[PDB]
């Protein structure tokens, strides 16, 4: 009912020496076809989907352990209002430049638009009632959302991060959370990027200055702490 | 005077195809002894200061052009209130773990405390009157500050980013800006990290997906586009 | 580009004209929960005629904003059906006033997203291209994307309608003003649970040369728009 | 250690049945010459300083009770960077319209500029070390400040509000706090406005809907509760 530290890089996580489920949230970031599925945004830009998809089954196991421990669980979906009123023109222009324009029709509907097949959370990690979903127009889950209000009213102080991609939406969310004083763990095997060297360097960045953004861990080490 | 695009990775920056100094700000991030000087935070943790100091002279040249062209200039200092009311305990404990506890007395005073010698902006990139200084308790310049009010008040839409470190305060500040729709350039030779691989990987991360966080460039290509 | 409005206490806006391309009409919380029988405000026993008098004037201002092509944004106060965005003090006060957020009344669960009492009333129904803000608080900025929507469209100027004058409208004006938005509040397109609070909310705006912006009757805006 | 509720309007404050100093902050809002002093912004606009000053003596006594019980104490100053980079032009234009332009030289230096005599907290409620000061460029204490960071790192859940003016900075701070889930008390005698009717109407707005922004009380009712541990 109170858990020990996780074997983590570069310190035994978290810093206060124990994980309380009543103050800990598992975050699942952007597990959507647009980031890890055929026909979606990342696929249409020519990136290797095996680099993102490897995180899925490890994440499913960590989601069951969080449900079993009564951790809070929060899901994120990167996406835009169908009218695109939350889409900066630079973001739109780059997506067109990369051959996968946000709001344009691809094999999985309108790219990164809320309500579209490619925007949905994949079945492997489907949310259930009582696990709030953040709909974010940005990479960072804090910006232009109610996330911080959801975390503060639940008294959350500790975040465990899974999702995609490691260097983009996961790292942005970790950095925003860290600046607010949240104690964050990132799971090396439940994340993935458009480039394996970016995945590795993003985990590596976390570990400097005695853990500038938190700690990294394998899901095996978290499942071990959770019993 | 408006200027054409910078030769950048992965697109000719900015996306809208001109640089207007009325709408552009040069950001100098955390050029402090604590991040690039003997006796400070980063030195005390045992990292190599030459990795952070190489960006100083190139930054001073970009600062000269930015003041030349009439674009706004904004400076940042990472630091805490002397009473540490703005210091999360996890940030404090990790700094102790690394051998350089925030608030502890080092060779340049209380480490990362506002008012202390190690927290001062180094003279090579000293601020002038009318160039606002951001005091931030975090790595991101937008969290717990007035930066967004300063930028919206001057009508800024475009940021040129310099300072340290590439993968920590610079990247966080770039990520925060980018999500609000600021168009951002990061200068490869005017930034630096506690690790060369982290600096290089931080620059490259920007360039993916057609420029997910904006674009990278050498100060040479910025100074060419400005006609300096 | 349109002329200034005959406003209190200066000719609004401060920069001397209204550009539809930089102006948004905001319609705040026109929901059965705030102005309709069977909703939150009715359940607390407040007088609905105080809130409902602003409706037909708002409809008229909504038509003039649509005709001039300015941005239109609507707000709905409401909570996630799981109530993860509901502070315990807000819930507790609502229970205390005999209309608990989430409790079932004639119009479904009070102040819950998806429920009949939460919907925007038809007299000011939104149309395509008019973004709706879903807010868990009185202020339209807190825990929403409102500021992203406005900044992306280049909005500098807000015209404020909706209910109530002293709660959600005043909070939203105070938030927008502090960010440097130039705000007009329409006296006849707002209403409160108390006439004195309505009038006092409006005069608070007019102090110190217009501390939060300016007040106007919809007639004065429509005269400016014509 | 833990204290009884306050006899407040419209419920015995706070909603969770007791006051814990470990989780409660006293906030002192904008007790500056520019709002309550001769030669300052409000004086230069022609408003009656007796309306703001009356709150000063009861505030000193509440400040004393807060420091005695070991509550957190936070002070705010409304003000602008000397370069005016945080000053929206509509704010400046209204101040010039009202005959007291922000940044302009008056009897107490540059009006509402940080570092100037008019801007200083007045000596009756001077901060001590360990009581953070918030420098805000707006009326609300949360916008473009670290206040939320200070409050959350200290585990503060409950606010007691004093300061000026009741209808501007104090109300705006209260609305911001309340929306984020903070439980707030506004002290009727430790606040004041440019208009008595605005002060009274600012306090009764709080009381509607079972206490839409929190509750109101007299310093006497607060001081009674702080003499009654449970």
Automatic annotation (TrEMBL), chain B:
UniProt superkingdom: Bacteria
Pfam families named in the record: Isochorismatase
Coiled coil: none
InterPro entries, alphabetized: Isochorismatase-like_dom (IPR000868), Isochorismatase-like_hydrls (IPR050272), Isochorismatase-like_sf (IPR036380)
Keywords linked to the UniProt accession: Hydrolase, Plasmid
Species of origin: Rhodococcus sp. Mel
Record-given protein name: Biuret hydrolase
Domain Isochorismatase-like as annotated: residue spans: 24-212
One example GO MF annotation: hydrolase activity
Stored CDD domains: cysteine_hydrolases (cd00431)
UniProtKB/TrEMBL annotation, chain C:
Domain of life: Bacteria
Keyword Hydrolase carried by entry: yes
Database matches in InterPro entries: Isochorismatase-like_dom, Isochorismatase-like_hydrls, Isochorismatase-like_sf
Keywords: Hydrolase, Plasmid
Residues annotated as domain Isochorismatase-like: 23-211
Lineage: Bacteria, Bacillati, Actinomycetota, Actinomycetes, Mycobacteriales
Keyword Metal-binding annotated: no
Signal peptide from the UniProt entry: none
Stated name of the protein: Biuret hydrolase
Single annotated GO MF: hydrolase activity
